[PDB]
Design a protein around this ligand. Structure first.
Ligand SMILES: O=C(O)c1ccc(/C=N/OCCO/N=C/c2cc(=O)[nH]c(=O)[nH]2)cc1
Length: 223
């Protein structure tokens, strides 16, 4: 395997020599010497491994990785087999079931099948100390993932951005609405899901928007 997918590296490596990025790398490395940090190194950049950067169709922006054992693996909201889907992911699957009648629950929480279809599952902060939510907040990841969002905004066309919650909406605030499609709703967490996420129908809406972009739809059940 590779640490960082080649097509993504080609376009994002301009970040790597910048002072914030050097500092970020040092911070994460030091944290790993004293704490268990999730995801493990080989999974920090899973979101670069699943499809070519040129083939991104949909972008779902997250915040912090899961902080429990075996959960985070470098794709926002996803958990690898055999880990049970956390409540936020169960809510995502519940909305899918009501939104698209023909959706089939895969019986696991691994969203790799979406990533392979060009659904970028990007957290803003890409590491977290075990059991400590937001422990790596504002250490440099935000600037890096802002650079990712900026690259896609400028160099791709007709993407669908799904911005769930106020944090994601802020991170996507500068997306050019004349050049990309943006859908917004509340966050799927249990505390916020009934404040707009249930009933948002973003999955069916996304596929209709992809038609306008001249692109084939996501098969949301291909998991
Ligand atoms: O800004 C808001 O409106 C808002 C509201 C509620 C929340 C809540 N989060 O609660 C934790 C739920 O689980 N999240 C998992 C999770 C896993 C992952 O890979 N990425 C990720 O972004 N989240 C966040 C933002």
């Amino acid at each position: 395997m590779e640490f960082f997918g080649e097509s993504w590296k080609k376009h994002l490596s301009g970040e790597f020599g910048k002072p914030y990025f050097i500092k970020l790398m040092g911070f994460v490395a030091e944290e790993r010497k004293h704490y268990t940090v999730y995801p493990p190194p080989h999974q920090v950049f899973t979101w670069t491994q699943m499809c070519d950067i040129k083939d991104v169709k949909v972008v779902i922006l997250g915040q912090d990785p899961y902080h429990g054992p075996n959960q985070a693996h470098g794709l926002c909201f996803s958990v690898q087999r055999p880990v049970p889907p956390p409540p936020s992911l169960e809510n995502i699957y519940k909305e899918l079931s009501t939104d698209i009648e023909d959706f089939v629950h895969p019986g696991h929480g691994d969203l790799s099948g979406w990533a392979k279809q060009g659904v970028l599952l990007l957290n803003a902060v890409l590491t977290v100390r075990a059991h400590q939510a937001n422990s790596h907040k504002e250490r440099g990841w935000e600037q890096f993932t802002d650079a990712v969002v900026s690259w896609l905004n400028q160099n791709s066309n007709g993407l669908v951005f799904l911005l769930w919650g106020s944090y994601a909406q802020k991170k996507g605030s500068a997306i050019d609405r004349k050049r990309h499609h943006v859908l917004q709703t509340a966050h799927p967490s249990p505390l916020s899901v009934y404040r707009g996420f249930f009933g948002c129908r973003h999955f069916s809406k996304t596929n209709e928007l992809l038609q306008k972009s001249g692109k084939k739809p996501i098969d949301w059940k291909e998991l």
